Amino acid sequence: KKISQYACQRRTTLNNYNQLFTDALDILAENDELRENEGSCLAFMRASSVLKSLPFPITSMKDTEGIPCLGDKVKSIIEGIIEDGESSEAKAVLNDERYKSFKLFTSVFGVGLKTAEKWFRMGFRTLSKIQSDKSLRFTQMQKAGFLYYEDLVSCVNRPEAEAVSMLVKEAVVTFLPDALVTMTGGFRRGKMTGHDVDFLITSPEATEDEEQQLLHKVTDFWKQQGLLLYHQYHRSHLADSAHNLRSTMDVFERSFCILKLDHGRVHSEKEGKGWKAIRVDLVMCPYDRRAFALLGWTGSRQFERDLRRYATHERKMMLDNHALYDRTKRVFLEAESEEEIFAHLGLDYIEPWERNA
Ligand SMILES: Nc1ccn([C@H]2CC[C@@H](COP(=O)(O)OP(=O)(O)OP(=O)(O)O)O2)c(=O)n1
Ligand SMILES: [Mg+2]
Ligand code: NA
């Protein structure tokens, strides 16, 4: 059984035997991202992903034999960890002022690479200096980011994700009683924590106007209930989906929210102000596209990249979050399940908890 270069042909659980190596590769990948060296970034992400799939810890360079996605640079990183138990390259990145600033500034919701670079070239290094600066101007998203900073850096746990799921279902069924609400993202893959809580909403009987209006009704409901702290709508691009017939362009309508989650709704083993701000991502898809949407929104991000790369390079197929197109047969392939999509691709089925690539 030769290890495939594709994450969609590997089983990746959360039982990682190479966390010393992958933690260092992840820092090195993030450094190339924040510095826009996309090629080097992709090589580090692919190397980290394949080590996450190994059923044993690397203890010598002989263990790397036959493993794909491990270049010369990655190999010297791995060598460095075998000898010392630490990466000199990743340590230098953690000590780098541009990396430290970019990591700290982008940890504010609403702050991307352009705003982070701008603050860094103005000589800013702390969030205290940014927030007290008289001349800086913040976007509405950045203001929410600063207001709810501590709650948002603190990640979401599974008990909080289930409390959000309850509010999502409760909101949705008010307008569409037959709607199916599925928790997607990291939590569907078995993650204990997440940066947000992802959801896919679909209805067997909703009309084009009903499905196109549901997300707007759900946020108005939360605004009326005093639970909406921030929101941003994302219009559907299903009529422009052919952009994916050549990362992916998002095709479904989405509502991104920041929700006020009272402690009393959370059923955990566990104060101050009895509520926490949570990032909630709500995706609405037409019923016949639900299998493609579920596969696309479950992730991981690397698993998605490899599913698409595999479809193109190995099967002359074009996969995106709403469909699968066969370039040879000149037809879209239908699927009512993720299992049917994997079968169409000629891939052994991978469970959501095995998609942690
Ligand atoms: N605009 C987007 C955002 C996300 N996704 C996919 C990629 C994986 C999945 C969930 O995205 P994230 O919430 O960012 O990731 P996650 O795997 O849930 O990890 P995290 O804990 O950071 O939320 O949806 C997508 O197709 N289009
Ligand atoms: Mg997520
Ligand atoms: Na950010």
CA-299 nearest atom, ligand 1:
8
What domain range is 57 assigned to? 1-95
Residues 278, 288 contacting (CB under 8 angstroms): no
Nearest CA to ligand 1 atom 8: 299
Task: Name residue, tokens 């996309």.
Answer: 38
Locate 102 and state its tokens. Answer: 């970019």
Locate 91 and state its tokens. Answer: 């340590």
- Distance in Å, CA 109 to ligand 2 centroid: 14
Task: Please check whether residues 138 and 160 belong to one and the same domain.
Answer: no
- Distance in Å, CA 175 to ligand 3 centroid: 32
Find the helix packing angle between 19-34 and 38-53, rounded to 10°: 160
Q: Which of 196, 250, 306, 320 is catalytic?
A: 196
Strand order in the sheet with 324-326: 317-319, 324-326, 331-332
Domain end: 255, 287, 319, which one? 287
Task: Please check whether residues 119 and 181 belong to one and the same domain.
Answer: no
Q: Which of 32, 151, 198, 320 is catalytic?
A: 198
Counting beta carbons within 10 angstroms of the beta carbon of residue 312, is it exposed (0 to 12), middle (13 to 18) or buried (19 or more)? middle
Contacts for 307 with CB less than 8 Å, ≥ 6 apart = 7, 8, 295, 319, 345
Nearest CA-CA partner of 300 in 5, 1, 12, 2: 12
> What dihedral do alpha carbons 123, 143, 265, 162 form, nearest 10°?
-70
CA atoms within 13 A on the CB side of 129: 10
Contacts for 51 with CB less than 8 Å, ≥ 6 apart = 16, 18, 21, 22, 25, 58, 67
Find the helix packing angle between 158-175 and 208-224, rounded to 10°: 120
- Distance in Å, CA 52 to ligand 1 centroid: 19
DSSP line for 106-141: HTSTT--HHHHHHHHHTT--SHHHHHH-SS----HH
Find the helix packing angle between 290-298 and 338-345, rounded to 10°: 80
Locate 196 and state its tokens. Answer: 């947000």
Split into its structural domains, the chain has a count of 4
C-alpha triplet 99, 309, 236: angle, nearest 5°: 80
133 in catalytic set? no
Task: Please check whether residues 23 and 76 belong to one and the same domain.
Answer: yes
DSSP line for 184-232: -HHHHTT-SEESSEEEEEE-SS--HHHHHHHHHHHHHHHHHTT-EEEEE
Task: Please check whether residues 213 and 306 belong to one and the same domain.
Answer: no
Cis? peptide before 48, omega within 30° of 0: no
Residues 300, 346 contacting (CB under 8 angstroms): no
Residue 278, amino acid: I
